[PDB]
Design a binder for this molecule. Structure first.
Ligand code: CL
Ligand code: CL
Ligand code: ZN
Ligand code: ZN
Ligand code: ZN
Ligand code: ZN
Ligand code: ZN
Ligand code: ZN
Lengths: 144, 144, 144, 144
């Protein structure tokens, strides 16, 4: 079977409503827009609106992810003081495969765009997996 | 101060002994040779020696995998009779991101080479994750 | 040889100066910041500052690319009127492998962040390759 | 309206005839079987039947490639004597992004399986691009 090329996509982001990000995987009122999923590679891209005081549940990146913090301030891997990074808008980060994000948090109301290659493994304190959340999970939470 | 290109690799495969593949994730005394891991993308490549009756524990591919069955016969996604496939050497298979392999098994003594983008999530019958096994887990099981 | 995991990275983007984007591949005064290169996969990520009236030379994406237009307006694949897209900030686009970008242009002063998997093939009107420009080329133009 | 998972594939390789590999990019009467193309990422996978003395035209890998030499002997990056490698079956090789293969050649009748992420840029001796040959080019050469 001859395969065709993949269609290009365009999203007018201000004509897409924010949705609450699942409470199972965050606290403090985080909202999101899913922008794209790639079913073949398993990559996906989203933007997040994160109130001051908000955070994501503990997780591990199984593939590389890259972010552009456009507004605010984000502590990753503990924040700069703890030997991680404190992203301050405008900030770019490369979170490598295997990166462990125990409590990514937002000291200031923030907005960040992130692309992910593959899923996030949400983990218990002992590192055991709770949920493996990737493109398909994202698409369903966004659109189903 | 600038990043370098990644080094090329070569493995003389017949000068590498088969090692036992982890019992936690397989049955039947499967052996393997780990050939490559890619830390950045999280891909990994190995060849497997699979006795008749052997199998891998239930798992989900979080990214694409590609196999070359060089000897024997493998039932994947339940075998062709079940709407899956039954690979017979020489066979090639593309296992797409999110492919669910509840019991990939070998009715005949077999050998196959396979590359994996990202981890395999080994799952309980309800789909709960047991372990997410990726490049560094493969390396770790091979090394020592 | 045991391989280690890839280091995470952080770039404070407002402490990095804009550089002129090569005249060989653009017109109208485009500036850029290279944010990241991935030597293994060949991916790279940059942000661009594009004056009104500016454009990039004709090119083909050999892999997928994704952009976030944070300011302004960008005509891609001819613009919406011509059957491409007119990105209007805030806009997201997925430019698939093989996408042909004859004259990506900026009717309004714009800023966009883009990630690229693999190089761009800059082409002559007849489609013949002039230059294949990827992570390594980007890193050298940025940093050497 | 939501994107579907990519379909799995299977090829019974012995029920596919060898076809001639393009003369534009090789010497010696190499034959091949194209096994898979991935439109989204731009990867592709094939097996090659290479007569003694055969070779591929000078090229650069824009992304990683991985080969399994199942029969014979291949000199890559000039052969091991030149600081390259000389693969002897059974051999595995990782050819990293940006690997320059001026004359990959076969001193003995050989066969190898290889997966490619992205295109090969075939080059003139000065490094100028002649042709960028990727998944869709492979498909096109195979199909008809
Ligand atoms: Cl998923
Ligand atoms: Cl490059
Ligand atoms: Zn994270
Ligand atoms: Zn499997
Ligand atoms: Zn792991
Ligand atoms: Zn473009
Ligand atoms: Zn090559
Ligand atoms: Zn092409």
């Amino acid at each position: 079977m001859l395969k065709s090329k993949i269609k290009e996509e365009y999203v007018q982001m201000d004509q897409v409503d924010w949705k609450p990000f699942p409470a199972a995987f965050s606290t403090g009122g985080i909202r999101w827009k899913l922008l794209h999923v790639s079913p073949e590679m398993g990559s996906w891209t989203a933007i997040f609106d994160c109130p001051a005081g908000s955070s994501f549940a503990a997780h591990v990146h199984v593939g590389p992810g890259e972010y552009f913090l456009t507004k605010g301030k984000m502590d990753v891997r503990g924040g700069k003081a703890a030997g991680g990074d404190t992203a301050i808008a405008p900030g770019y980060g490369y979170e490598s495969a295997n990166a462990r994000h125990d409590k990514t948090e937002f000291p200031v109301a923030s907005e960040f765009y992130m692309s992910f290659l593959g899923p996030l493994t949400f983990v218990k304190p002992d590192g055991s997996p709770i949920a493996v959340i990737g493109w398909e999970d994202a698409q369903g939470a966004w659109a189903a």
